[PDB]
């Protein structure tokens, strides 16, 4: 049976999966779990995914509860022999290493800042603390791009899809004026037709955060190319 | 050339890699990076791994900066066709999904609690908050063990090696009296000869945390079997 994706498009890891689904033209079923209404605690969803997180994928008897596993699974089943999840071991391990940087470092710090803002209100967040932590992630990604125009090498991989959604989300708040390779990479990712799958949920997240957090993101921070405007 | 592991054995993800290296009898080189003295910021290590984290593995030109990538890489190179990282796609995706639970959920919450304790002192930590967050991880792992005696099924996998080190670390602080399947699994993991590679660094972490945090872990919390005593 075809895969079922449980999602809230405001979530960056969800958007990474939506981008892969569009890029590979995968036929999936969709289920909307509204995180800002606590629907991830609904008894059937919680029994499915005890971590109460999106994205979640059901594919026959296989239940995946992490975007990075979903990206790998979908690439292996719907892009066998492709370049997004390369067959060469060293190349594949570099993509895996970068998926784990997204999970462990970039998303962790984005999520800490955004979660604090929803729970406490923007006025009660240590914004300078979060600016340092997220700028530190920008420094790292600028270094990852020193010798290549994509995160894992000269070609688009799953790592770019995982990172770009969270990067777009961080960049609602923190500008890309001092990270030229990162800004150029983001600009290039915005020209991909698959990037259209990031746009609705990024904008919904922007509006939801400004409402629930009682603030406005700095209008100058977000990088918005002509194609996406 | 043989792999080089950069490590501090106090780190649970480091200990997962030490356990795999012992289990598979892998010949690696070792480099000690003392995290409690800031040696992860030494210029050569920071150039190698901009995330300033252990474990880091150098294997020829391949540089891995995440325990979960290291576990997968080492299983693929030193246990090809084995059961720790199974070849069957659905089984492999279940192990991957659990490695990502360790990264995203269990380690995130352990690290938040332990990092707060080092930075602020135990007296300045919201222990009840961290107890709730880590008990929630215990609830999830008890559910993962409802139908199997290892985390991903009836056999030891990389998921057990990744999870047991962080679980042992959480359980210095929070008891396993209300999580019987999880306690039984931990007791079983302690009987594996590879578990000996967890013991020195768990004890060093216990002593370092009590010194730097100015507290004592509850002596009753840790589960310590006869083999490990
Ligand atoms: N490592 C996970 C992170 C998933 C995650 O934390 N998603 C958030 C939204 S960005 C979520 O579902 N939050 C709801 C909750 O934790 O209750 C992945 O990559 O899928
Ligand atoms: N997701 C990473 C986590 C690595 C990590 O954060 N390790 C800690 C020790 S438990 C570290 O090196 N901390 C030093 C620092 O962040 O400066 C992995 O699995 O390797």
From Swiss-Prot, chains A, B:
InterPro entries: Glutathione-S-Trfase_C-like, Glutathione-S-Trfase_C_sf, Glutathione_S-Trfase_N, GST_C, Thioredoxin-like_sf. It is an enzyme of class 2 (transferase). One of its GO terms (molecular function) is steroid Delta-isomerase activity. It comes from the Eukaryota. One of its GO terms (cellular component) is cytoplasm. The keyword Magnesium does not apply. Expressed in the adult ovary (at protein level). Residues 1-82 form the GST N-terminal domain. It catalyses: RX + glutathione = an S-substituted glutathione + a halide anion + H(+). CDD domains: GST_C_Delta_Epsilon, GST_N_Delta_Epsilon. One of its GO terms (biological process) is ecdysteroid biosynthetic process. The keyword Lipid metabolism applies. Keywords: Detoxification, Lipid biosynthesis, Lipid metabolism, Steroid biosynthesis, Transferase. Belongs to the GST superfamily. Epsilon family. PANTHER family: GLUTATHIONE S TRANSFERASE D10, ISOFORM A-RELATED, GLUTATHIONE S-TRANSFERASE E14. Conjugation of reduced glutathione to a wide number of exogenous and endogenous hydrophobic electrophiles. Essential for ecdysteroid biosynthesis. May be involved in detoxification. This is Glutathione S-transferase E14.
């Amino acid at each position: 049976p075809k895969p079922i994706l449980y999602y809230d498009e405001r979530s960056p890891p969800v958007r990474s999966c939506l981008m892969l689904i569009k890029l590979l033209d995968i036929d999936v079923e969709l289920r909307f779990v509204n995180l800002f209404k606590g629907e991830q605690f609904q008894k059937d969803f919680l029994a499915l995914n005890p971590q109460h997180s999106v994205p979640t994928l059901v594919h026959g008897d296989l239940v995946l509860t992490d975007s990075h596993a979903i990206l790998i699974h979908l690439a292996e089943k719907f892009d066998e022999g492709g370049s997004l999840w390369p067959q060469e071991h060293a190349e594949r391990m570099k993509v895996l290493n970068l998926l784990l940087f997204e999970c462990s470092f970039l998303f962790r710090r984005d999520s800490d800042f955004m979660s604090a803002t929803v729970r406490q209100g923007f006025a009660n967040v240590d914004v300078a603390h979060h600016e340092r932590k997220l700028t530190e992630a920008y420094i790292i990604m600028e270094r990852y791009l020193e010798n290549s125009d994509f995160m894992a090498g000269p070609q688009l991989t799953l790592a770019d899809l995982s990172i770009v959604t969270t990067l777009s989300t961080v960049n609602l708040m923190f500008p890309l004026s001092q990270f030229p390779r990162l800004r150029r990479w983001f600009t290039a990712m915005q020209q991909l037709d698959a990037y259209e799958a990031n746009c609705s949920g990024l904008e919904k997240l922007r509006q939801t955060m400004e409402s629930v957090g009682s603030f406005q993101f700095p209008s100058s921070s977000a990088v918005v190319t002509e194609k996406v405007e």
